[PDB]
Design a protein around this ligand. Structure first.
Ligand SMILES: OC[C@H]1O[C@@H](O[C@@H]2[C@@H](CO)O[C@](O)(CO)[C@H]2O)[C@H](O)[C@@H](O)[C@@H]1O
Ligand SMILES: [Cl-]
Ligand SMILES: [Cl-]
Ligand SMILES: [Cl-]
Length: 389
């Protein structure tokens, strides 16, 4: 359990494997980054380009500069910022499109809160890296749009048409239920507002950060279970029995992050207690001694090992270790990284990470790059460990 060795292995992995892979996807002919790479490492240069992917690339290279001081990474972030500003930002109705073509032609023009949140997250990180206030101004405008067009008493309406007329929340629902409230969307609003507030100390941003933290404590968390509600209606009634172990452990450390900034000391204590309760129950129920399982939908336990779940497990257990100094969390975090190294890091040349292996540890055919597989979960796992003192 050598933490210095752990950190230097993560830094070496980030610099030798993850950063060069994502740099190789830069699209200098059309802007942005290539949108898709299949299981066999074939890039589709003409694939549509997802906005979540672009914003996660923007966040990643900006954070690489902020932590490692790599000027080349800052340039790669600039490239992602330009494509966001020029192609993903809707000149007619504002906010970010869901996807554009390889040329930047709008393809899916619907406006989802999840996409706007990742815009805020990446733009605020880019402001820190570049000093370019326009990025912070765009982040603040996305914040204003979420608060004034998308927010209601019980949280955010999650999906809209291009012109901000409400729509059914299908892109963020799963398991055959159309959920109008998802923990997933609300968690990434919380994440983006934490990063925004960290860099922009405005009362309106603070109050919205406290508000979404309170929603997690009072409505989304199921007290004493270590579990968050997953897919709900607008009253946060669960539409299906479901537990997402990866979202639980990601929420644990993201809630602790936000708690740093709370001025309500009672709330802060409740949040820190809740975050540890989630970490403890997740370790007990989902960690098998090498890695974390995925989710339970109704009675079906998915024991596949998903790349982003294991990444968030390393961060979430390392955070629980830092808070408690209980060695069990440190051991679980390092063991999960060893699992990743052995089973999810791609051994082919000039590759990255695999999407998943099944319970039997066999790789399943899945893309390496797409709208939902980016450098954010795995890059952040490295950057977060490196950052912490
Ligand atoms: O159901 C939405 C979408 O969720 C994807 O898993 C995502 C992941 C994307 O890398 O990032 C989270 O938001 C973590 O906070 C997860 O919810 C899933 O891969 C994708 O299939 C699904 O459509
Ligand atoms: Cl561009
Ligand atoms: Cl805590
Ligand atoms: Cl990602």
């Amino acid at each position: 359990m050598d933490i210095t060795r752990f950190k230097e292995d993560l830094k070496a992995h980030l610099e030798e494997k993850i950063i060069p892979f994502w740099q190789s996807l830069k699209d200098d002919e059309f802007g942005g980054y290539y949108g898709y790479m299949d299981f066999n490492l074939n890039i589709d240069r003409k694939a549509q380009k997802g906005c979540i992917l672009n914003s996660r690339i923007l966040w990643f290279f900006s954070a690489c500069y902020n932590v490692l001081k790599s000027e080349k990474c800052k340039e790669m972030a600039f490239h992602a910022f330009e494509f966001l500003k020029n192609k993903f930002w809707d000149k007619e109705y504002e906010g970010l499109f869901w996807s554009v073509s390889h040329k930047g032609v709008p393809v899916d023009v619907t406006k989802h809160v999840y996409v706007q949140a990742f815009g805020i997250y990446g733009l605020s990180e880019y402001y820190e890296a570049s000093g370019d206030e326009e990025a912070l101004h765009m982040a603040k405008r996305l914040f204003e749009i979420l608060e004034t067009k998308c927010k209601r008493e019980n949280g955010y309406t999650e999906q809209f048409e291009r012109n901000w007329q409400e729509k059914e929340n299908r892109f963020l629902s799963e398991n055959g239920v159309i959920a109008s409230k998802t923990m997933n969307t609300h968690l990434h609003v919380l994440e983006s507002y934490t990063n925004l507030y960290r860099l922009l100390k405005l009362d309106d941003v603070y109050e919205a950060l406290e508000w979404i933290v309170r929603l997690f404590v009072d409505k989304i968390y199921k007290k004493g279970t270590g579990h968050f509600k997953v897919f709900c209606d607008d009253n946060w009634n669960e539409l299906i029995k479901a537990v997402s172990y990866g979202h639980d452990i990601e929420a644990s450390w993201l809630l602790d992050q936000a708690a740093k900034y709370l001025k309500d000391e009672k709330l802060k204590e409740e949040v820190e207690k809740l975050a540890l309760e989630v970490a403890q129950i997740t370790l007990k129920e989902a960690f098998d001694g090498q890695s974390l399982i995925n989710e339970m939908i109704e009675d079906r336990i998915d024991r596949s090992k998903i790349w982003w779940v294991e990444a968030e497990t390393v961060v979430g257990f390392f955070n629980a270790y830092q808070k408690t100094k209980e060695e069990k969390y440190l051991d679980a975090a390092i063991k999960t990284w060893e699992f990743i190294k052995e089973h999810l890091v791609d051994r082919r040349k000039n590759s990255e990470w695999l999407w998943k292996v099944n319970e039997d540890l066999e790789a399943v055919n899945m893309p390496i790059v797409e709208q939902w597989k980016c450098p954010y979960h795995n890059g952040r796992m490295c950057l977060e460990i490196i950052k912490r003192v």
